[PDB]
Amino acid sequence: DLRPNPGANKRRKRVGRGPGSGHGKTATRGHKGQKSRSGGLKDPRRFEGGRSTTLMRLPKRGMQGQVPGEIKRPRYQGVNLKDLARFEGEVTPELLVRAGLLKKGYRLKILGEGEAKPLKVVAHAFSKSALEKLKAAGGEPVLLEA
Amino acid sequence: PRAKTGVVRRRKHKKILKLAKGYWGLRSKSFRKARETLFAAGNYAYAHRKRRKRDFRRLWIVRINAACRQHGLNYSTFIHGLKKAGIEVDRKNLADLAVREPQVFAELVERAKAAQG
Amino acid sequence: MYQIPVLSPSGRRELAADLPAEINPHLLWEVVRWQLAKRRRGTASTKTRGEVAYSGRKIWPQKHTGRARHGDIGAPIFVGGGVVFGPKPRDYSYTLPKKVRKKGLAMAVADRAREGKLLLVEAFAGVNGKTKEFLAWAKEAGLDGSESVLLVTGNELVRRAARNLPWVVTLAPEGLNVYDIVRTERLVMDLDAWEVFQNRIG
Amino acid sequence: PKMKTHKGAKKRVKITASGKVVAMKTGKRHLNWQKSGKEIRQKGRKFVLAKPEAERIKLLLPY
RNA sequence: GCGGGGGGAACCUGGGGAACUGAAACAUCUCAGUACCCAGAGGAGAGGAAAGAGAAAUCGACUCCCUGAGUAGCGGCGAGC
RNA sequence: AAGCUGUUGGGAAGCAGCGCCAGAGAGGGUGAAAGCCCCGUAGGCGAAAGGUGGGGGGAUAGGUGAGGGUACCCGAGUACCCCGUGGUUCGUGGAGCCAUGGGGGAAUCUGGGCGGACCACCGCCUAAGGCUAAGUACUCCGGGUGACCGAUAGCGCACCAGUACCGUGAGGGAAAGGUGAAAAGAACCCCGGGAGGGGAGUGAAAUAGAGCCUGAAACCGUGGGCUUACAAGCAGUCACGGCCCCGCAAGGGGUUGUGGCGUGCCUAUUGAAGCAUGAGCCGGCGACUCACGGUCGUGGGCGAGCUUAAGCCGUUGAGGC
RNA sequence: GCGGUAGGGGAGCGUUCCCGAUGCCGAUGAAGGCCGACCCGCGAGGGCGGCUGGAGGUAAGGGAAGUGCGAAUGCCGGCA
RNA sequence: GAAAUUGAACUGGCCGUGAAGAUGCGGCCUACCCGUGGCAGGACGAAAAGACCCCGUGGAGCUUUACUGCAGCCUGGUGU
RNA sequence: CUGACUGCGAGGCCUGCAAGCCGAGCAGGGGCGAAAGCCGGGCCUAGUGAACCGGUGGUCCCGUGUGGAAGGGCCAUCGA
Ligand SMILES: [Mg+2]
Ligand SMILES: [Mg+2]
Ligand SMILES: [Mg+2]
Ligand SMILES: [Mg+2]
Ligand SMILES: [Mg+2]
Ligand SMILES: [Mg+2]
Ligand SMILES: [Mg+2]
Ligand SMILES: [Mg+2]
Ligand SMILES: [Mg+2]
Ligand SMILES: [Mg+2]
Ligand SMILES: [Mg+2]
Ligand SMILES: [Mg+2]
Ligand SMILES: [Mg+2]
Ligand SMILES: [Mg+2]
Ligand SMILES: [Mg+2]
Ligand SMILES: [Mg+2]
Ligand SMILES: [Mg+2]
Ligand SMILES: [Mg+2]
Ligand SMILES: [Mg+2]
Ligand SMILES: [Mg+2]
Ligand SMILES: [Mg+2]
Ligand SMILES: [Mg+2]
Ligand SMILES: [Mg+2]
Ligand SMILES: [Mg+2]
Ligand SMILES: [Mg+2]
Ligand SMILES: [Mg+2]
Ligand SMILES: [Mg+2]
Ligand SMILES: [Mg+2]
Ligand SMILES: [Mg+2]
Ligand SMILES: [Mg+2]
Ligand SMILES: [Mg+2]
Ligand SMILES: [Mg+2]
Ligand SMILES: [Mg+2]
Ligand SMILES: [Mg+2]
Ligand SMILES: [Mg+2]
Ligand SMILES: [Mg+2]
Ligand SMILES: [Mg+2]
Ligand SMILES: [Mg+2]
Ligand SMILES: [Mg+2]
Ligand SMILES: [Mg+2]
Ligand SMILES: [Mg+2]
Ligand SMILES: [Mg+2]
Ligand SMILES: [Mg+2]
Ligand SMILES: [Mg+2]
Ligand SMILES: [Mg+2]
Ligand SMILES: [Mg+2]
Ligand SMILES: [Mg+2]
Ligand SMILES: [Mg+2]
Ligand SMILES: [Mg+2]
Ligand SMILES: [Mg+2]
Ligand SMILES: [Mg+2]
Ligand SMILES: [Mg+2]
Ligand SMILES: [Mg+2]
Ligand SMILES: [Mg+2]
Ligand SMILES: [Mg+2]
Ligand SMILES: [Mg+2]
Ligand SMILES: [Mg+2]
Ligand SMILES: [Mg+2]
Ligand SMILES: [Mg+2]
Ligand SMILES: [Mg+2]
Ligand SMILES: [Mg+2]
Ligand SMILES: [Mg+2]
Ligand SMILES: [Mg+2]
Ligand SMILES: [Mg+2]
Ligand SMILES: [Mg+2]
Ligand SMILES: [Mg+2]
Ligand SMILES: [Mg+2]
Ligand SMILES: [Mg+2]
Ligand SMILES: [Mg+2]
Ligand SMILES: [Mg+2]
Ligand SMILES: [Mg+2]
Ligand SMILES: [Mg+2]
Ligand SMILES: [Mg+2]
Ligand SMILES: [Mg+2]
Ligand SMILES: [Mg+2]
Ligand SMILES: [Mg+2]
Ligand SMILES: [Mg+2]
Ligand SMILES: [Mg+2]
Ligand SMILES: [Mg+2]
Ligand SMILES: [Mg+2]
Ligand SMILES: [Mg+2]
Ligand SMILES: [Mg+2]
Ligand SMILES: [Mg+2]
Ligand SMILES: [Mg+2]
Ligand SMILES: [Mg+2]
Ligand SMILES: [Mg+2]
Ligand SMILES: [Mg+2]
Ligand SMILES: [Mg+2]
Ligand SMILES: [Mg+2]
Ligand SMILES: [Mg+2]
Ligand SMILES: [Mg+2]
Ligand SMILES: [Mg+2]
Ligand SMILES: [Mg+2]
Ligand SMILES: [Mg+2]
Ligand SMILES: [Mg+2]
Ligand SMILES: [Mg+2]
Ligand SMILES: [Mg+2]
Ligand SMILES: [Mg+2]
Ligand SMILES: [Mg+2]
Ligand SMILES: [Mg+2]
Ligand SMILES: [Mg+2]
Ligand SMILES: [Mg+2]
Ligand SMILES: [Mg+2]
Ligand SMILES: [Mg+2]
Ligand SMILES: [Mg+2]
Ligand SMILES: [Mg+2]
Ligand SMILES: [Mg+2]
Ligand SMILES: [Mg+2]
Ligand SMILES: [Mg+2]
Ligand SMILES: [Mg+2]
Ligand SMILES: [Mg+2]
Ligand SMILES: [Mg+2]
Ligand SMILES: [Mg+2]
Ligand SMILES: [Mg+2]
Ligand SMILES: [Mg+2]
Ligand SMILES: [Mg+2]
Ligand SMILES: [Mg+2]
Ligand SMILES: [Mg+2]
Ligand SMILES: [Mg+2]
Ligand SMILES: [Mg+2]
Ligand SMILES: [Mg+2]
Ligand SMILES: [Mg+2]
Ligand SMILES: [Mg+2]
Ligand SMILES: [Mg+2]
Ligand SMILES: [Mg+2]
Ligand SMILES: [Mg+2]
Ligand SMILES: [Mg+2]
Ligand SMILES: [Mg+2]
Ligand SMILES: [Mg+2]
Ligand SMILES: [Mg+2]
Ligand SMILES: [Mg+2]
Ligand SMILES: [Mg+2]
Ligand SMILES: [Mg+2]
Ligand SMILES: [Mg+2]
Ligand SMILES: [Mg+2]
Ligand SMILES: [Mg+2]
Ligand SMILES: [Mg+2]
Ligand SMILES: [Mg+2]
Ligand SMILES: [Mg+2]
Ligand SMILES: [Mg+2]
Ligand SMILES: [Mg+2]
Ligand SMILES: [Mg+2]
Ligand SMILES: [Mg+2]
Ligand SMILES: [Mg+2]
Ligand SMILES: [Mg+2]
Ligand SMILES: [Mg+2]
Ligand SMILES: [Mg+2]
Ligand SMILES: [Mg+2]
Ligand SMILES: [Mg+2]
Ligand SMILES: [Mg+2]
Ligand SMILES: [Mg+2]
Ligand SMILES: [Mg+2]
Ligand SMILES: [Mg+2]
Ligand SMILES: [Mg+2]
Ligand SMILES: [Mg+2]
Ligand SMILES: [Mg+2]
Ligand SMILES: [Mg+2]
Ligand SMILES: [Mg+2]
Ligand SMILES: [Mg+2]
Ligand SMILES: [Mg+2]
Ligand SMILES: [Mg+2]
Ligand SMILES: [Mg+2]
Ligand SMILES: [Mg+2]
Ligand SMILES: [Mg+2]
Ligand SMILES: [Mg+2]
Ligand SMILES: [Mg+2]
Ligand SMILES: [Mg+2]
Ligand SMILES: [Mg+2]
Ligand SMILES: [Mg+2]
Ligand SMILES: [Mg+2]
Ligand SMILES: [Mg+2]
């Protein structure tokens, strides 16, 4: 096969609208036709009227922050045991971070629906329901500590 | 990649100018006046393409009425009788028989007369 | 597809490899496009009404002048003055997904193999980096110039010998890419080159 | 270049897990003086919006 | 006796330091330590061997790039940064 | 490195014939389209003198140990605190740390700063002296390369340009490239004061004749065909007719006599033929882009997964990690 | 079923540039220009014929924009 | 041997009509083709993107017991 | 006598937004009545103000190495 027609399979058409002409998007050019169609409209996203925005709502979202700001803390990443049921042997945060579901969130914590495999599991915490569903299958040690 | 205006604007202009010939003054030499006058001309042409019908209908009708009035009746009586006779014949134009073969026209006058009432 | 002919000093035996049967032309389109758009290089330049070399003074009062109404001569309405939306230097290349690349590659080699034009070789009598030797060897392999040929091998000397030839294009094994595969009607390459080709994908 | 998030928005609006936008019921801070207990419960909750709702989303989205 | 003086397209450091404009007015803020003036530097300059980072009993001079991140935060908690 | 013959042409590199080199089939010139005609190209070779030169090699300056005891030293109007401010994401905020104009004013390891007011505890660090390459930035200069310009473009300037010219001055700031392969640049005769032409001659071409390739449009003229001096017109259009012209034929081209009809273009407008706005006419320049970040749609790759960024390796339009 | 401004949608034409190009077209004459009552397309436009001109041009199929002018008391030049 | 100006012109009167103020529309009347010398009624004649008026959350100059600032002066503590 | 209750709220009215308005019924605990039942203020339609900012009380919260404290959040109520 050769450069005669690898051509894009009849849908990608670069046909950008060229509005300056006598037919298509004549004169006024693009949707304009009036005024205050010049440099640029004020936003409009959040803005305008000049009245009060929707800004009449309010921040209940407290703890917005202090000057030192963010307080670093062990962020807990959860994981359903139905996605854990994909493989079987004896899991540790290493295996979970290797599989695809963890992403170095570090503090692992199995939970949720799905069905339990009788395998073993080390974590940092355990949800009640998961702990029970897995209790009806196999063993499980708690976190390291930190 | 840059692309000057180049040949294009001339070519187009020349094309319009080709129709402009025959017009008076700048109206046939200058592209702009040529364009305007060509527009007006186009519209006039389209309208008179419908005018032609009315005009010829009228001419025919006058001639028919004249030659018909030579025999004794007017165009109204003529068409009344003719359409009443059953002769859907003669798209009014073909009543040119007023000119050539007026005898046929006369027989038609009779056939309209008797069938009129 | 599979049953490609392998040439060696001992006969015309055969071989086999994966090489998908189905071949989406649009994929080759996007890969080749990516290649030609990455090999592209931005350089076209122009100057704005501020990139000009003129003054800024209002050329005349505008009030009572009777004339038009203008500012500095750098304005694009002026001849010589700044360009409007002229091209500036910019990067045309992007990141086409690796999967797509290896895909299209294997697909190109596949199509060339399906046409039968592919040919794995090991016999290289044209040892010394000399055109006439490669010409005789090509005369042996059934090459003749009737078909444009892409040659792929790690041998520097063979590369040299085939380099000047117009109906042929030199190429390293790591240089293997869809554009060159598409260019030439017929593909010929080394067992080692085909091995590392299989190493990228196979 | 690279849209900065609207800090005012996030400090007072929550994006739903699906797509809707949630804010607190207004009218429960300054107008109180002897307003009925019916008021201060129904104003204590949060709610959706409508078409400014669709505007709100744009003001975030890296978030 | 040794050295200095002046020049150099842009780059660099330091000493000074705006307003239009933005906020659909405007004064806090914004444009911005940007324009510019001045001094000084060299093929670069600045920076640089912790009285540091800040949460790991962890890192181990400085500079530059990607990411961290439009996060932490700052803000007539507005514009915006 | 590797070319001769025939052929057409004013001229071959074209055409036809057989043939040759290639680690060179990049390109440029040669009267037209050259791998082999010239300059080059692939690939190699080269410095008495100057510059550069840890990449390598030598040399020096320099540096290298354990335990005990003693109370000597360890950067001053400094630390620290307060007043007024700067820097940091920090606008006084619960406002620390670093920096310091004013005031008070120590300690020398049982010392002192700091980890966001302050306190305790737990830890990090040694202030008030100084030096240092590399990685980074830029482009007056040199080279390379363009899905960059092609004389209104591209640097303002392809050309005797920051010139002419303008302004007291700082400053402003242009236009202007083109004979032909070769000047072979037109002797001599003729008209003319010259200018300028007519022969003649050169040349493929002089409709390449010297601001000379190609020579568009407005605009100005000459000749010719048609037409007009009782006719009321956005200048056209439809109809028939006459004169003129190309064609066997039928038809067609040009013009306009009479007849029917007919309130320029753009814009701004409730509304224009408007006594509302803009254009003397012609040619060229001229206006919805790009970057990053979003959002729906969309063509594909993959799929509980998908994708890499800087960079490194490679190459010199080769991609890979 | 088909009047149509603002506006939305669909399908196309031409200009420059790249792949297709170590190619094909070009002195038996390229691009550009002038002319036409001829051919094709609804149209933007493409093609042929005569003349001029003298060295370049670029298919089918794709790619990228300094891409189409009649007006801005627009800009430059030329001429009424 | 210029100039402003100039959409194009084959540019008449009345009565009406119409964005109400028509050489261009309708109706009627008038008028052989081209110029020279004069007048200035019309072409809302030329000239200046109205100096009057209003609008713009435009600019600038001035005022004061408009607001907030700054210089300058008065003033307590402190260093000298 | 104190339902001028606390924890809610099916379903609507009106409505661009926000906002305003009607409300059966469930759980807790009480009022009046023998009971049936009625009570989440007044025959009803005006008697009012998003947000930012701060005052006060309260509490399952956060609180920058850890323990406190400063500060902040949440609930209640206050400054037009
Ligand atoms: Mg339309
Ligand atoms: Mg227009
Ligand atoms: Mg309007
Ligand atoms: Mg805008
Ligand atoms: Mg609140
Ligand atoms: Mg903790
Ligand atoms: Mg999950
Ligand atoms: Mg143009
Ligand atoms: Mg005519
Ligand atoms: Mg009829
Ligand atoms: Mg600028
Ligand atoms: Mg400038
Ligand atoms: Mg200048
Ligand atoms: Mg200016
Ligand atoms: Mg004027
Ligand atoms: Mg060799
Ligand atoms: Mg190679
Ligand atoms: Mg109320
Ligand atoms: Mg209540
Ligand atoms: Mg509550
Ligand atoms: Mg409620
Ligand atoms: Mg800097
Ligand atoms: Mg504004
Ligand atoms: Mg203002
Ligand atoms: Mg201001
Ligand atoms: Mg600043
Ligand atoms: Mg230094
Ligand atoms: Mg800790
Ligand atoms: Mg480290
Ligand atoms: Mg170290
Ligand atoms: Mg800040
Ligand atoms: Mg020979
Ligand atoms: Mg020969
Ligand atoms: Mg010959
Ligand atoms: Mg020859
Ligand atoms: Mg080469
Ligand atoms: Mg030449
Ligand atoms: Mg060529
Ligand atoms: Mg050859
Ligand atoms: Mg060499
Ligand atoms: Mg050398
Ligand atoms: Mg040597
Ligand atoms: Mg030397
Ligand atoms: Mg010597
Ligand atoms: Mg020695
Ligand atoms: Mg020693
Ligand atoms: Mg010290
Ligand atoms: Mg002091
Ligand atoms: Mg202290
Ligand atoms: Mg501060
Ligand atoms: Mg302070
Ligand atoms: Mg604060
Ligand atoms: Mg100590
Ligand atoms: Mg101490
Ligand atoms: Mg510290
Ligand atoms: Mg602390
Ligand atoms: Mg300690
Ligand atoms: Mg200090
Ligand atoms: Mg450096
Ligand atoms: Mg260069
Ligand atoms: Mg190039
Ligand atoms: Mg020029
Ligand atoms: Mg030119
Ligand atoms: Mg010019
Ligand atoms: Mg002069
Ligand atoms: Mg002056
Ligand atoms: Mg001078
Ligand atoms: Mg100029
Ligand atoms: Mg020449
Ligand atoms: Mg002569
Ligand atoms: Mg004389
Ligand atoms: Mg010739
Ligand atoms: Mg010729
Ligand atoms: Mg000359
Ligand atoms: Mg020429
Ligand atoms: Mg000429
Ligand atoms: Mg001429
Ligand atoms: Mg001419
Ligand atoms: Mg006649
Ligand atoms: Mg008469
Ligand atoms: Mg008339
Ligand atoms: Mg005659
Ligand atoms: Mg006529
Ligand atoms: Mg007549
Ligand atoms: Mg007529
Ligand atoms: Mg208006
Ligand atoms: Mg009027
Ligand atoms: Mg007016
Ligand atoms: Mg007006
Ligand atoms: Mg206009
Ligand atoms: Mg005018
Ligand atoms: Mg105009
Ligand atoms: Mg013009
Ligand atoms: Mg756009
Ligand atoms: Mg959107
Ligand atoms: Mg959406
Ligand atoms: Mg689609
Ligand atoms: Mg597919
Ligand atoms: Mg998809
Ligand atoms: Mg799929
Ligand atoms: Mg990037
Ligand atoms: Mg990114
Ligand atoms: Mg590279
Ligand atoms: Mg190479
Ligand atoms: Mg319709
Ligand atoms: Mg329609
Ligand atoms: Mg409209
Ligand atoms: Mg070009
Ligand atoms: Mg190319
Ligand atoms: Mg090419
Ligand atoms: Mg010839
Ligand atoms: Mg020839
Ligand atoms: Mg021929
Ligand atoms: Mg010819
Ligand atoms: Mg010729
Ligand atoms: Mg061209
Ligand atoms: Mg062309
Ligand atoms: Mg031609
Ligand atoms: Mg068609
Ligand atoms: Mg045509
Ligand atoms: Mg044509
Ligand atoms: Mg032709
Ligand atoms: Mg040439
Ligand atoms: Mg093409
Ligand atoms: Mg225009
Ligand atoms: Mg114009
Ligand atoms: Mg002009
Ligand atoms: Mg003149
Ligand atoms: Mg007018
Ligand atoms: Mg006439
Ligand atoms: Mg009367
Ligand atoms: Mg009148
Ligand atoms: Mg009137
Ligand atoms: Mg009429
Ligand atoms: Mg009339
Ligand atoms: Mg007027
Ligand atoms: Mg007057
Ligand atoms: Mg004006
Ligand atoms: Mg005005
Ligand atoms: Mg005005
Ligand atoms: Mg004035
Ligand atoms: Mg206004
Ligand atoms: Mg005013
Ligand atoms: Mg206002
Ligand atoms: Mg307003
Ligand atoms: Mg104002
Ligand atoms: Mg203003
Ligand atoms: Mg104002
Ligand atoms: Mg003034
Ligand atoms: Mg002012
Ligand atoms: Mg005054
Ligand atoms: Mg002040
Ligand atoms: Mg003084
Ligand atoms: Mg004092
Ligand atoms: Mg004193
Ligand atoms: Mg309550
Ligand atoms: Mg109520
Ligand atoms: Mg109830
Ligand atoms: Mg009782
Ligand atoms: Mg009861
Ligand atoms: Mg009730
Ligand atoms: Mg009451
Ligand atoms: Mg009562
Ligand atoms: Mg209200
Ligand atoms: Mg409060
Ligand atoms: Mg409070
Ligand atoms: Mg308490
Ligand atoms: Mg508490
Ligand atoms: Mg704490
Ligand atoms: Mg507080
Ligand atoms: Mg509190």
Contacts of C30 in chain A (CB under 8 A): 8
What span, in angstroms and rounded, lies between the C-alpha atoms of C74 and C77?
8
Neighbours of ion ligand 11 (CB under 5 A): C 50
From the list C4, C191, C199, the residue with the least C-alpha distance to C110 is: C4
Q: Which of residues 32-61 of D touch strand I (CB under 7 A)?
A: 32-34, 36-45, 47-52
Q: Which residues contact C58 (CB under 8 A, 6 or more apart)?
A: C70, C71, C72
Name the closest residue on chain A to residue C115, using Cα atoms.
A1
Q: Does strand E come within 7 Å of the CB of A70?
A: yes
From the list A145, A137, A78, A80, the residue with the least C-alpha distance to A108 is: A78
Chain C interface includes A16 (CB < 8 A) = no
- For chains A and D, having 3+ Cβ pairs within 8 Å is answered yes
Contact C201, C104 (CB under 8 A): no
Q: What are phi and psi of C99, to 5 degrees?
A: -55, -45
From the list C38, C189, C60, C44, the residue with the least C-alpha distance to C123 is: C189
Q: CA–CA distance from A136 to each of A27, A80, A85, A131, C155 (Å)?
A: 76, 16, 15, 9, 65
Q: What are phi and psi of D22, to 5 degrees?
A: -120, 135
**Closest-lying nucleotide for D28 based on CA to C1':** I50
Strand partners, A90: A120
Q: Which of D10, D12, D55 sits opposite A46 (nearest CB)?
A: D55
First to last CA, chain A: 61
Through-space separation of residue C55 CA and nucleotide G16 C1' in angstroms: 32
Strand partners, A138: none
Q: CA–CA distance from C13 to each of C5, C53, C56, C120, C202 (Å)?
A: 6, 72, 79, 10, 20
Chain A interface includes C180 (CB < 8 A) = no
What span, in angstroms and rounded, lies between the C-alpha atoms of B35 and B16?
7
Q: Which of residues 26-85 of C touch strand G (CB under 7 A)?
A: 29, 33, 36-37, 44, 46, 62, 65-70, 77-79, 83, 85
Q: Does strand E come within 7 Å of the CB of A4?
A: no
First to last CA, chain C: 12
Give long-range contacts, CB 8 A cutoff, 24+ apart: B109-112. Answer: B109/B68, B109/B71, B109/B73, B109/B78, B111/B82, B111/B85, B111/B87, B112/B73, B112/B77, B112/B78, B112/B81, B112/B82, B112/B84, B112/B85, B112/B87
The ligand minimizing its distance to the Cα of A146 is: 28
Instruction: State the DSSP string of C10-73.
Output: S---B------S---HHHHHHHHHHHHHHS---------TTTSSS--S-SS-SSS-SS-----T
Method of determination is X-ray
Contacts of C115 in chain A (CB under 8 A): 1
List the chains bordering chain D where 3 or more Cβ pairs fall under 8 Å. Answer: A
Contacts of C108 in chain A (CB under 8 A): 1
Q: Does strand H come within 7 Å of the CB of B35?
A: no
Cis peptide before A44 (omega within 30 of 0): yes
- Total residue count of chain B as it appears in this document: 117
Report the 10 Å Cβ neighbour count for C106.
21
Contact B33, B26 (CB under 8 A): yes
Q: CA–CA distance from A37 to each of A20, A22, A99, C51 (Å)?
A: 16, 20, 54, 27
CA dihedral C44, C49, C55, C56 (to 10 degrees): -160
Judging by beta carbons within 10 Å of its beta carbon (0-12, 13-18, 19+), is residue C110 exposed, middle or buried? buried
Q: CA–CA distance from C76 to each of A26, B99, C52 (Å)?
A: 22, 73, 10
Contacts of C112 in chain A (CB under 8 A): 1
H or E segment and range at residue A80: strand A76-80
From the list A127, A144, A139, the residue with the least C-alpha distance to A81 is: A127
Q: CA–CA distance from C34 to each of A2, A116, C178 (Å)?
A: 16, 47, 11
The ligand minimizing its distance to the Cα of B3 is: 108
Contact C111, C31 (CB under 8 A): no
Through-space separation of residue B67 CA and nucleotide F31 C1' in angstroms: 85
**Angle of helix C131-140 relative to helix C156-163, nearest 10 degrees?**
90
From the list C137, C24, C144, C43, the residue with the least C-alpha distance to C89 is: C43
What span, in angstroms and rounded, lies between the C-alpha atoms of A124 and A116?
18
